[PDB]
Design a protein around this ligand. Sequence first.
Ligand SMILES: *C(=O)[C@@H](NC(=O)/C(=N\OC(C)(C)C(=O)O)c1csc(N)n1)[C@@H]1N=C(C(=O)O)C(=C)CS1
Length: 268
Amino acid sequence: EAISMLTERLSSIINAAGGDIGIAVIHVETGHTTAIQGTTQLPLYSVFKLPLAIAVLKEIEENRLQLDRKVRVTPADVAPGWTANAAMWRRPIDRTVAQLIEVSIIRSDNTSSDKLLQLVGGPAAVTHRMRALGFPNIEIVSTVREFSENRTRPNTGSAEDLARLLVQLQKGELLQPQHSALLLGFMHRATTGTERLRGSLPVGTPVADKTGTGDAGVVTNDVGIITLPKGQGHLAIAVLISGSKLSPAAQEKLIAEIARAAYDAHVS
Ligand SMILES: *C(=O)[C@@H](NC(=O)/C(=N\OC(C)(C)C(=O)O)c1csc(N)n1)[C@@H]1N=C(C(=O)O)C(=C)CS1
């Protein structure tokens, strides 16, 4: 029956991909869950910026921080190898906490993410916030710089915990309404995953997403929320691909095809 056999189809889409692949698809309103290796913790790379943004917004909601607090960013905060977004960080600049979350989510900025990581108390504090919220299978152990000088101790998370996190975000149970609207607005405008969760959906499908990419196709990740048409609800979806044999383009196409299969199963 269409959602019953989604696991069969997902398993054949990723067959012979090699590596380690975790998938979780959760229908937000009903809770219907489809998972493949859904409890295995896999390298997150830039996907960790989504738990980071939640921990930052929890700090504001727990009255230890403000959205409009000015934070000074200097070229000293940019790691050497960070080439993608470094153009905004060449002379000292003041950004509000809201603006730091913005650029870290939309542009997958490493510099602003590491600044936010310090504001909340480092990797251990984010890991604690995750279990305090109900997601004990998300372990943040490294800053972005630390991990960049040696890929050995990566931040990991299971696909099911990321999807469950997105379910509560979409439902309005995770953050205050204005913080939920603010974060989903950022994720709707994210520009790093045009070929992934959005790649194969029908024209006009709203998608909020956060990607993760390692160099040379070592890791290709995408987690997000797909708005179904009609009044059919939302899909929280996490795809974590680690160490695949496939080329980068084919790994992105794997994510796009997984999303379209989950979309098709849950739409009438
Ligand atoms: C999150 O996953 C970030 N990724 C990285 O910092 C790494 N590589 O980034 C790219 C741009 C793919 C590169 O070729 O250098 C990375 C860190 S440790 C490792 N083995 N690789 C951000 N992701 C992207 C993206 O395009 O998804 C960015 C635009 C900026 S860094």
